[PDB]
Amino acid sequence: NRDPASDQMKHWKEQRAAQKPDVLTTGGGNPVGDKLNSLTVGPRGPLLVQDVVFTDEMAHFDRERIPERVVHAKGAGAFGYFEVTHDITRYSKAKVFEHIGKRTPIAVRFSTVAGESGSADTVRDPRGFAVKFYTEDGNWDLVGNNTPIFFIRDALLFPSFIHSQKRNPQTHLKDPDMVWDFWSLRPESLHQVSFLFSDRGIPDGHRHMNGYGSHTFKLVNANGEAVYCKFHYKTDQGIKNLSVEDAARLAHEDPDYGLRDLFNAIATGNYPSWTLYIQVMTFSEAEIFPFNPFDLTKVWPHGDYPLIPVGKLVLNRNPVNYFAEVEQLAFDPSNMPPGIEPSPDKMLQGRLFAYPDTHRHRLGPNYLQIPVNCPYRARVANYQRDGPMCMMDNQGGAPNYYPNSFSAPEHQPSALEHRTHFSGDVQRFNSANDDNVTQVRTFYLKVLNEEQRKRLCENIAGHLKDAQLFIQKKAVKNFSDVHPEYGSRIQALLDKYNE
Amino acid sequence: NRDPASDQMKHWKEQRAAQKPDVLTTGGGNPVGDKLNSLTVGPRGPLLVQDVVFTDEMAHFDRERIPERVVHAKGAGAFGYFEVTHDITRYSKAKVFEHIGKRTPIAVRFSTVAGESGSADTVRDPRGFAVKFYTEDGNWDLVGNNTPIFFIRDALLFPSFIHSQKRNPQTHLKDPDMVWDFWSLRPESLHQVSFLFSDRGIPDGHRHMNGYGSHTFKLVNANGEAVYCKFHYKTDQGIKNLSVEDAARLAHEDPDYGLRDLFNAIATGNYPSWTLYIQVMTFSEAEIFPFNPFDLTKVWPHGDYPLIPVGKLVLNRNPVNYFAEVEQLAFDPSNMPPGIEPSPDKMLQGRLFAYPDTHRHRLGPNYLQIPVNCPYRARVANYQRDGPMCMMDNQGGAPNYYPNSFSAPEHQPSALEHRTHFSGDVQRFNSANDDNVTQVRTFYLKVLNEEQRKRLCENIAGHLKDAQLFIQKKAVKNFSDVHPEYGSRIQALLDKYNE
Amino acid sequence: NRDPASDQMKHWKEQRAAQKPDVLTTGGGNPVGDKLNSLTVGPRGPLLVQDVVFTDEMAHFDRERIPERVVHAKGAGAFGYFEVTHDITRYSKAKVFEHIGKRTPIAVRFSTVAGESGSADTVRDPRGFAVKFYTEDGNWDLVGNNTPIFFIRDALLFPSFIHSQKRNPQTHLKDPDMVWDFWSLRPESLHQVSFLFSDRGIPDGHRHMNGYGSHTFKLVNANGEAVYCKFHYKTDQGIKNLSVEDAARLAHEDPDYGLRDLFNAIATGNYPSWTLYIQVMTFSEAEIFPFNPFDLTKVWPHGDYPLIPVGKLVLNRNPVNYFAEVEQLAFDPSNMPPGIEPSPDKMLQGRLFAYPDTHRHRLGPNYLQIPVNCPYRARVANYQRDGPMCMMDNQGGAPNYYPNSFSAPEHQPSALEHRTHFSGDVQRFNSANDDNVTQVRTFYLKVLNEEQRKRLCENIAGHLKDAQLFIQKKAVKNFSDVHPEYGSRIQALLDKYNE
Amino acid sequence: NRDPASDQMKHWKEQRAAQKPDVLTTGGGNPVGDKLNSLTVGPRGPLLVQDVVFTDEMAHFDRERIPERVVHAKGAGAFGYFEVTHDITRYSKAKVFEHIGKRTPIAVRFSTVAGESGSADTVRDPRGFAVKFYTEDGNWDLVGNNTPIFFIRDALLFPSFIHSQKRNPQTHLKDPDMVWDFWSLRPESLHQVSFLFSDRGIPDGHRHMNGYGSHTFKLVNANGEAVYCKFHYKTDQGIKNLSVEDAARLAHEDPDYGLRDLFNAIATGNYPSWTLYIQVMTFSEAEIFPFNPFDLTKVWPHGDYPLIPVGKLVLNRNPVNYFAEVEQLAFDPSNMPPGIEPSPDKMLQGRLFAYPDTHRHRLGPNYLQIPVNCPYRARVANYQRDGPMCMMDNQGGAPNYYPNSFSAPEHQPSALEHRTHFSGDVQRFNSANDDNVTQVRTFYLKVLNEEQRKRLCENIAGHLKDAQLFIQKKAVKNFSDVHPEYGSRIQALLDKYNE
Ligand code: HEM
């Protein structure tokens, strides 16, 4: 006997032994007489187009694939529910927080960042942790990572960052000179790079890491009052990491380690769960906050802004078909129910457009009619019509223009957005010299003990050594600008690695 | 009060007069507060990206259109059923003919040929008359015209012919030179060209015209015995045409005459219906048939092959949304249940490839998952997975390879194709010189009377006069080769038209 | 002989009389021995798959069509040049205005609005007049109409307006109820609706109508100083209109009237040309302007802001292939070179996104690499890579991230935008009741004469009569709000039209 | 200093040191002023829509990815030439074999089979060895692997096989039950499974393995006489294979080993080259050949059919951009010039459709106008027009129909195909029971020595142990059918692996 994942077909058969197999048909439902031998004129003769059974099957095989995600391509998927445990209605009027005990079906997709579809799971990289809440007020997508921060704070640099993390445009190889020349030219990446090369850069699966909204969001209560918040959902299974040596063995031993881990866990009853906290920051506090409260390279410290518990995320169901239920998942940070709203964070502002845009390209214009993406607990009604692969009644004969004297849908005034005042020159403001070291200094000195610092500089050195010397010198200087010992320890290891 | 097509919204409001209007939501189901005014900074300021309400609607609007059909773009639709009235089980085992009284749902599309999505309905052209049967043995698509014959009898000429009948590649205008230079260089079009320019080239709507499969098809019964057959579905409302004078007036007074006529008839309960007939030709009749019995430019004379009734087609239901239920309709001649098989007709052999092919482009690789395209009265079980816009569970976690020892769907031996013997060189045989006149001489002399021959010639000269003299001179010869007086009458009207 | 357009093929043969015809190949360049007969086993045998000559040609015929434009689908195109005749460098620094006598290649496409690809040209509708300037500083797409104004002044109402102006979602018929219920619930359309139903609603071909940018734009000279502007290009051939009687006749006699008139004009040397003008409004004039200077239902009166001539637009070349050079043309209002910037107009702000978005859907992600869409007079260099249908070297092995220490493209500081100060609440401001009648009153009384007011009301009642009485009464009220005689005349005509 | 592949950007800067960096522009050619900061209202404000620089770039980033090859996704590319070195003009009239010394540009792509884009290169799997010849007679694609044979012999089993070799539809994991349940149930895979699991299952990169056409192909000379032939292109660098121990180390130390090995060789002048041979079988020898001479699981022994040299394949140029020149490479076995034709091989017959079909989806309808896919050594002329992303004149105003009296391209009679006589019932012949053991017994006994047989069984046991017992017992039987000692050795090791 083996693990549950290996016995998938065995159990699909046992769960069916009481029936007769189905008739094998064509896309059009036409039963097939023989689907092992093609229609030819004579045993050793050529093929006939009269063999549509072949053309119907081959033509579909030729179109099985779709474009993989531009980032976070390698992913795992599961399904569960979110249950409310405390009361934060004073901050948010979102239906998903209405009363204690409220359950909401969720869908979750873990993922790496840079690897393509076939890459390994146990590698140094951030981890995606997108969560989709199916509320009565529409879908709420919390597209979070395993880290509360990122490498940059402007969306215009994001394509550049991804291009620097992926393959060379001529050799198609992972290029160290592309990784560090970018990081060393943008020191604001110092904070997230220190997280990434720590022990938590390679989690022991998806069940032993936290998730974070990272972005500052906005919560609105029933009175129309607003506060800024962060989202933290911590693992109830405890932080656990893989060492460089073990993570490298599993890289070729089991490229799908975290995929097999998640599936076998839920199958054997071990339902992983996460505890959803929030930090809150009033509008007044945001004005005096030392750093920019909407800078994605900054955290709200815990001592000044403690964690407030909200509810639990539980995963208790596997997918039945991976492609239909995981590959075709689409999380839009633009999907936000009343009571939740975005902050002026430049990074989140770009994500408001990027995700719906790429989905219409990767999946299709009407990707929201795919089952797992549908807001199936909300009544979708508007004046949108047509588009490729329209799957419902297309809202039937309802008037397709607004306004109209024929009682088509109506706007709901209570769903208006919070009104905030802004004044200033419409202009591209230079955010490259916002504090790039302070919070990193605290992490290096006060969060990491001595052993962890030691492993931090060995992981960085082990990867930075491949770059050219002038890139090493620039990166080390940026590490010196955090702590003189931080840099000089990296430099020491580099002096050795350079023979 | 007006016709019921104009009172569509008025009736939609009335059927909703009780309940309240719905909550207008984004595609993600999030209710919108205000969708008549955009999110700006000040009353006269710029637009924000935060306005995801604007983005979500505009983006879908930007993606409303799909590629129209490469032919038969202007279309009218309706739905209904097919009821068997006579027993033809001795020729065919297709479940759709199982017993008298059995009903099978149908979906029909009426169309022109050459015009685009905005062309008038009352123009001189063939009429599409495609019928989709939803049988338990899958969908059966009888994709026929309002003519038993076509202009050509080899598929390789089809892209050419259609190019000739559409717009010049430079001027993007209807070019008579392109029209007649092809018809005159390929006199096989004589037969269908004679049909086209007579009185039935412009039918008074879609309810006053016949429908034919034109192709020779093969029927197979329960013993395995096979015969060839034609399909005729004759209008029970009576052949009724439009004059050239009335057709031109309606071309600008009501570009959507046929579309409106159909809708109003069904709405007021005046349901149109047709009577399906078949001709039967034994295998030994096909060897002695004076012409090529699979020639698409030929018919089977009624005297030697009478009409055998089968059942009734009845259209009693209008579309609720035109785009979802008619524009996305996909007919594949290769959708054939056991009991109905293709003949060696060179044209039909090509249509087995082109319709599923063009549909993967127009609609999508998984277009058979669109509700109106689905075979929703059969069980579609097979080893095809994935593809963009997968809309069911994608067959779950069923084994996806064949053969397997895990009890996935099996092949049904009874559904094997009837077996014919062929012998001959594999080469490109020349069919340009099959009798191109005989069956036209019969139509011109024995079917048409004095007045109908006169109008036939006038309609030809009224359009052939715009072609160069060398193209006219050749076309006239082909008409003289049918019957001398045929070319003389045409040439006598061209001598005048050329001043 | 005939007109030049009809003789398109005759002239293509003559221009090649000296050469031998080319060898006919597959798409892969493989010569074809025969393409009139299909590969079959024996003269009356089935078609083979070996016949790759058929599949290669048929597969591309099955994929010839693309989605038509979601608006302005029916169109006509030509090419030429823009020449500067007057100095306006004090206002703008755009290299297209640098010095008198400078020429810039242009590509123009005229169009209607609602009709699909097959509709007629001579119908009552606005007329598109897009102009693509190929500047050294990139393309400049002036996507104007044949009117200075529009029906709405907020982009969120644009999908709705279009839906109303197109076909009912159930009947697929032009619906007067949808037209006037919208126009009557949004009386800001009074201005443009009065333009549409006057004599200039149906121009005589595309050469006898003006072109306007419509939107307020911004110009920026070298010193950083900025003003607001309007772009008026007036026909050098004179305003000329078709009567309702003659527009209906041509609608069926020559649906492609405009298309044929443009081609024949250019082919006979009679090149149409326009005179580009601008208005100018200082930032201070904007602050006191009685109306909202960025309202798209408003014009800047001539007496207060007189026309300033700039240059000449001349169309002196016909497209060689229509699809490649006209159907695939893509104008992006967002394509603006330094010196030309957008105003805060709510509608223009929505057009900066809409056009590239839909062009990626209609043509493809890399649509800008199509020859006619390329900025083939600028050197495109940046960090964008890959995509479907990549056609060049993809900028080679250039560093694909930014910033970088390997001398890849750099930013040009002089090309920064003009900086404006805005202040106000971020909310959805209601503009529905901006003055809706004033400049319509002036138009009805001062601009039209007695005869023209008579025809304006006859055209309005002739089409409004088909709508429901409650919609009639509402629209007449809106017309009464412009001038009591305006609505009283329309009502007197509706009384008769209602028997 | 490092290897050439990692110094790619270093060399790109050096080859440009003389000139100054280009001006960074939008896609429309517009210079940007600042692309590191986004346009906002105040330094901590929201993002604007008129930031068309951000949207322009992001929208293209959102559309970087296309569907990966449904099989052979992981690949590496290089370019060179083919040079004739022996005269085989008595067999084939193909222009690529015209005379000794004739050179023809080529394009090659190496690949694995099952892994996705991100998988490792040094894994047990067949290898793709595709070659594209740019001949005057169009393009000739010899889409070959590194094996003369394949697992199956009927294309109706191909999508199945690939499904089993890839990921389970639910867990998305490699499934040893799917692998061997397919292989055990189809014993025709014995010949190739033995090849797969021998030392040549893992080659030391792409420069040390052979290439084969596998299929039987037809050659036709200038007189019209035909013969059947095989293509072998052996490596001039010598066969070299990785051990299971090292292959696994390199799977996590350098996932891209094969790609790096290729690029470094070319860049350093050590150009790899292959020697093309052919085997020849007359039509008479094909009637008496022991097995089916078109059975893809069968080779032609060298004693009865010796290799006949032809020429050399040389790779001397790396790609400049991987995506444009390798990811967009499309090989169609149907691309065959006069002198080379397909045989009745049931597997090749399916490919004649599958590759053009999938390319029109993966890349698009006009994928042949992509540079690297263009037959740029030939002159494409035909009556195919339009399509998404039409990139040249679209053949201008040339007549788009055929036949035509306007001197458009003509057919070349000499390019007609060879004519072969076929006779027999048109039906689906059962090929499951063609000799599945005779040629494998020769390989096991006579080709391999004592050591290799030992490692062959071990390699098989290591992977077969993971499958269920009832699949092991059946697989072992198929190996006992080849040789008792073959099945014995495997069973003895499976007895140990099952504890
Ligand atoms: C402006 C900055 C960013 C841009 C433009 C961007 C863009 C994208 C795009 C286009 C995708 C592909 C989505 C799909 O194909 O369905 C994606 C995936 C993803 N991104 Fe980002 N990203 C940004 C930053 C971030 C941030 C800040 C986070 C977390 C806080 C994040 C987490 C993720 C995750 C988890 C996924 C995978 C979602 C899934 O499972 O489908 N990204 N991103």
mmCIF file of C-alpha atoms and ligand atoms in Angstrom, chain A residues 69-72 109 111 128-130 143-145 150 155 158 212-215 296 329-331 347 350-351 354-355 358-359 362, chain D residues 58 61-62, ligand 1:
data_model
loop_
_atom_site.group_PDB
_atom_site.id
_atom_site.type_symbol
_atom_site.label_atom_id
_atom_site.label_comp_id
_atom_site.label_asym_id
_atom_site.label_seq_id
_atom_site.Cartn_x
_atom_site.Cartn_y
_atom_site.Cartn_z
ATOM 1 C CA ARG A 69 0.651 32.421 -15.567
ATOM 2 C CA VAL A 70 3.285 35.045 -16.295
ATOM 3 C CA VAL A 71 4.290 34.732 -12.627
ATOM 4 C CA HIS A 72 3.409 32.121 -10.004
ATOM 5 C CA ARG A 109 -3.766 28.312 -4.571
ATOM 6 C CA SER A 111 2.675 28.795 -5.746
ATOM 7 C CA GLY A 128 2.033 32.774 -3.334
ATOM 8 C CA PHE A 129 -0.955 32.338 -1.039
ATOM 9 C CA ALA A 130 -4.000 33.627 -2.911
ATOM 10 C CA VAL A 143 -3.904 37.710 -3.290
ATOM 11 C CA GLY A 144 -1.269 37.440 -0.583
ATOM 12 C CA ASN A 145 2.218 35.993 -0.283
ATOM 13 C CA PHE A 150 8.026 42.932 -1.462
ATOM 14 C CA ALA A 155 4.410 48.965 -10.178
ATOM 15 C CA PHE A 158 7.586 45.077 -11.525
ATOM 16 C CA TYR A 212 0.082 38.119 4.416
ATOM 17 C CA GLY A 213 -1.857 40.715 2.487
ATOM 18 C CA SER A 214 1.364 42.768 2.577
ATOM 19 C CA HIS A 215 -0.566 45.725 1.193
ATOM 20 C CA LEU A 296 5.195 47.844 0.431
ATOM 21 C CA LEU A 329 -8.324 29.914 -10.965
ATOM 22 C CA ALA A 330 -8.160 33.704 -11.290
ATOM 23 C CA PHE A 331 -7.658 36.026 -8.315
ATOM 24 C CA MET A 347 2.026 48.666 -5.937
ATOM 25 C CA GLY A 350 -1.041 48.723 -10.443
ATOM 26 C CA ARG A 351 -2.445 45.343 -9.410
ATOM 27 C CA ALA A 354 -2.947 43.989 -14.098
ATOM 28 C CA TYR A 355 -4.831 40.922 -12.865
ATOM 29 C CA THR A 358 -3.919 39.175 -17.892
ATOM 30 C CA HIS A 359 -6.852 36.875 -17.148
ATOM 31 C CA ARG A 362 -4.597 33.785 -20.251
ATOM 32 C CA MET D 58 2.043 46.393 -18.027
ATOM 33 C CA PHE D 61 3.761 42.103 -19.649
ATOM 34 C CA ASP D 62 0.301 40.681 -18.946
HETATM 35 C C1 HEM E 1 2.396 45.802 -9.307
HETATM 36 C C2 HEM E 1 2.851 44.678 -8.748
HETATM 37 C C3 HEM E 1 2.455 43.289 -9.303
HETATM 38 C C4 HEM E 1 2.004 42.962 -10.532
HETATM 39 C C5 HEM E 1 1.804 43.886 -11.754
HETATM 40 C C6 HEM E 1 1.739 41.534 -10.546
HETATM 41 C C7 HEM E 1 1.283 40.802 -11.618
HETATM 42 C C8 HEM E 1 0.854 39.504 -11.565
HETATM 43 C C9 HEM E 1 0.253 38.750 -12.646
HETATM 44 C C10 HEM E 1 -0.028 39.280 -14.065
HETATM 45 C C11 HEM E 1 -0.022 37.522 -12.192
HETATM 46 C C12 HEM E 1 -0.679 36.384 -12.997
HETATM 47 C C13 HEM E 1 -2.078 36.119 -12.451
HETATM 48 C C14 HEM E 1 -2.784 35.102 -13.308
HETATM 49 O O1 HEM E 1 -2.235 34.713 -14.370
HETATM 50 O O2 HEM E 1 -3.896 34.672 -12.919
HETATM 51 C C15 HEM E 1 0.382 37.445 -10.802
HETATM 52 C C16 HEM E 1 0.275 36.342 -9.978
HETATM 53 C C17 HEM E 1 0.366 36.358 -8.609
HETATM 54 N N1 HEM E 1 0.859 37.397 -7.845
HETATM 55 FE FE1 HEM E 1 1.593 39.156 -8.561
HETATM 56 N N2 HEM E 1 2.034 41.030 -9.288
HETATM 57 C C18 HEM E 1 2.474 42.080 -8.498
HETATM 58 C C19 HEM E 1 2.862 41.972 -7.181
HETATM 59 C C20 HEM E 1 2.386 41.018 -6.313
HETATM 60 C C21 HEM E 1 2.163 41.180 -4.894
HETATM 61 C C22 HEM E 1 2.443 42.486 -4.125
HETATM 62 C C23 HEM E 1 1.692 40.018 -4.403
HETATM 63 C C24 HEM E 1 1.272 39.642 -2.952
HETATM 64 C C25 HEM E 1 1.171 40.560 -1.984
HETATM 65 C C26 HEM E 1 1.597 39.093 -5.514
HETATM 66 C C27 HEM E 1 1.159 37.788 -5.446
HETATM 67 C C28 HEM E 1 0.772 37.013 -6.517
HETATM 68 C C29 HEM E 1 0.199 35.673 -6.459
HETATM 69 C C30 HEM E 1 -0.084 34.847 -5.177
HETATM 70 C C31 HEM E 1 -0.039 35.290 -7.716
HETATM 71 C C32 HEM E 1 -0.640 33.939 -8.142
HETATM 72 C C33 HEM E 1 -2.159 34.031 -8.073
HETATM 73 C C34 HEM E 1 -2.750 32.716 -8.517
HETATM 74 O O3 HEM E 1 -2.667 31.735 -7.727
HETATM 75 O O4 HEM E 1 -3.305 32.672 -9.645
HETATM 76 N N3 HEM E 1 2.029 39.731 -6.661
HETATM 77 N N4 HEM E 1 0.918 38.680 -10.453
#
